[PDB]
From TrEMBL, chains A, D:
InterPro entries: Acr30-35_AcrF1. This is Uncharacterized protein. Pfam families: Acr30-35_AcrF1.
RNA sequence: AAGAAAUUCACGGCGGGCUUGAUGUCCGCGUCUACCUG
């Protein structure tokens, strides 16, 4: 639903962050790129926050994708 | 009637070993026995800022301190010896049999079909020019990947051994062979006659390769990097782990397969420009391209998806059978 | 139409080896074969505190006992031999081909453009004065970085070798050449004709350099330091790790590139003052400056960002093409 | 905060033990003498213990400062 | 008071960076006494 770009060269698990927009919020549905079954997402404000807390996570380079993936998969927001 | 397999999977026939780089001097080329391996050294870098910055929302004083400072880090760059001119890559690629005999058979009728298609494309289409793709675009040493760049003379010595004894002893000069078009070579037709004797299940074949890039002294390399996933926090120093065998420098078999999986200029777009690695979805990892996209019909996953029903691909079969060789 | 690449990356053509410092005596200058390497020693220091205080908020009992004490650490300071006057720097910088043929092509149309721009700036602008920047500001031995300071006579011997044999044998005296302006030298035009035969893809070229600073006896050096990131706690003694090859003292290739990446006085501010290292964002690491800032238009990342659309840079192209040579 | 003397001729790392008192306990904040950023401290009883376990650590001379520094920097007490 | 279970098929990590700069470790010191390699 109103799909946009990824976060920077998945994979490393066949898992991806796969940010895509909603009409008001933006969902960050951590998912595969094969058959399609995701793990837990998180809904929040626009891309301007998405790059902000995405850059606000530790590690360098690919570890930001991975620590972002573990950070979203233990979600609070249903 | 005769639907596709629910879960098919094929063994990587035409397998591939690891490389152990080790450095030598010419006219001591023949005596590569006591040739010492090349340990992955550890340089320690101080950075700069060559990366472009964002265009959405900024403040122009950030690059004064950022472009000022030094985000310095250690990089384990594998470096040659001091007084060694040559190089080394010892890989026994052994070719398995059974070009399309599967490893998983989620429907046996589809297995009888695919064995019928190895019977057709191995009976009708002879594997002369097929293994001439797996040799004339892998003797021209795409084996040596980034270290091929500006060699004096990168010599490939594909020895071949029954046993401790070795009979097929073919020698080359891989700078006299292109990487965009396969040209007519007699000894390349001997080696492709030998992979003819490999993929069509004739003999035990393990090709001990000894590639000698004669580049220079202490210059860098292109050894296969490891990763820094959840290890850039405990150590938090290295940023490029050149992977190791026991005391040497690898080339991971993962990189080493598209040395020889680079087969087909049988793609959608190019003519004599790009000879990519023959894959399902034909995707190269460099360019972030998808040659042979879904909307085109040059997929591997449309080659039995059409050939298992209607038997017509007509010599793009090779980029739909070599997708099954590996 | 014809947007920029999403991920472009270029190989460092005009590569660079490591240096192995080794010490010699003059009139034994020619016989630098058995010349012994210079082991990184371990001096063991003690000092005072010359680093100032932080001026926000203090307690005055701190700083007196701060200054009065001894920061006695060990410092691995590489030191010359006892009775050796000369020096050594053995580096084979080999120049790769393909001045703008990429390594990643996130859009092939941009690759056809940039190959068109190497066709223009390699066809129209001849690389005579270009390689005269990469020689006349790197034969005047900015190669030897901090050890250049007050040499008697720092002699550079850029031998050049096809093979074990070596034909191009040019000798110099790098104290007769400035570091702010490149002056007209005939043999420097021969060497720049040779890097003309390198970057424009004519021959295998690896320049074995043997620089001999004839400074003095047991004096210190300027070898490239390592780091102390998460190693100043297990050992917690050393504070300056002079990095090593096998038993010798490095100059890391990271420092060694802005010996030769120091090309352009084509910056925004200076005229004949500062000849910095030709980089994206032209940032020198010393001064914490940003020559060619974002608000100015002398960026590398505005040279195809304007040239790939509008074809006009007009001879500041050289500081936008040499940003792509390395 | 209520600063007192050191432990015996730092440095060797530009790092110091830099014992200074609290109103009840005494903090041992292992720190630089330049800009000021410390590593982990330890809070305990008075100076009479500080010299006791400080002399209770192995090595001789400067190695007691160093092994005390590594002993405090892997702290238990926040 | 558990007893049996083909987890496997294959897989380009590369791309490029100046760590640097500067330093009093010194000061004293009884190893110690004897003894069948048969």
């Amino acid at each position: 639903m109103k799909f946009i770009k990824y976060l920077s060269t998945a994979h490393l698990n066949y898992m991806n962050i796969a940010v895509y927009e909603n009409g008001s919020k933006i969902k960050a549905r951590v998912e595969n790129v094969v058959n399609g079954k995701s793990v837990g997402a998180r809904d929040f404000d626009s891309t301007e926050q998405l790059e902000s807390w995405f850059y606000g996570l530790p590690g360098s380079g690919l570890g930001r994708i991975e620590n972002a993936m573990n950070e979203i998969s233990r979600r609070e927001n249903p | 009637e005769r639907k596709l397999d629910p879960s098919d999977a094929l063994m990587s026939a035409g397998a591939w070993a690891q490389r152990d780089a080790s450095q030598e001097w010419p006219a001591v080329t023949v005596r590569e026995k006591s040739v010492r391996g090349t340990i992955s050294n550890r340089l320690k870098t101080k950075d700069r800022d060559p990366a472009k910055l964002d265009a959405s929302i900024q403040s122009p004083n950030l690059q004064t301190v950022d472009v000022a400072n030094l985000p310095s880090d250690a990089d384990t760059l594998k470096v040659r010896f001091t007084l060694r001119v040559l190089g080394g890559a010892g890989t026994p690629s052994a070719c398995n049999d059974a070009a399309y005999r599967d490893k998983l058979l989620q429907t046996v009728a589809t297995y009888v079909n695919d064995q019928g298609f190895a019977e057709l494309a191995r009976r009708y289409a002879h594997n002369l020019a097929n293994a001439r793709f797996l040799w004339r675009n892998r003797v021209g040493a795409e084996a040596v990947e980034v270290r091929i760049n500006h060699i004096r003379q990168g010599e490939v010595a594909r020895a071949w051994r029954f046993d401790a004894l070795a009979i097929g002893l073919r020698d080359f000069k891989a700078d006299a062979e292109l990487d965009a078009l396969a040209e007519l070579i007699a000894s390349g037709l001997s080696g492709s006659g030998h992979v003819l004797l490999e993929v069509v299940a004739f003999a035990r074949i393990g090709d001990g390769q000894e590639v000698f890039p004669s580049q220079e002294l202490i210059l860098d390399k292109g050894d296969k990097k490891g990763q820094k996933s959840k290890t850039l926090y405990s150590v938090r120093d290295a940023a490029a782990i050149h992977s190791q065998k026991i005391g040497n420098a690898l080339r991971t078999i993962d990189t080493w397969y598209p040395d020889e999986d680079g087969l087909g200029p049988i793609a959608v777009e190019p003519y004599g420009s790009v000879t990519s690695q023959g894959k399902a979805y034909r995707q190269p990892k460099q360019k972030l391209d998808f040659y042979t996209l879904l909307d085109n019909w040059v997929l591997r996953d449309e080659a039995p998806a059409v050939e298992q029903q209607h038997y017509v691909i007509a010599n793009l079969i090779r980029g739909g059978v070599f997708g099954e060789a590996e």
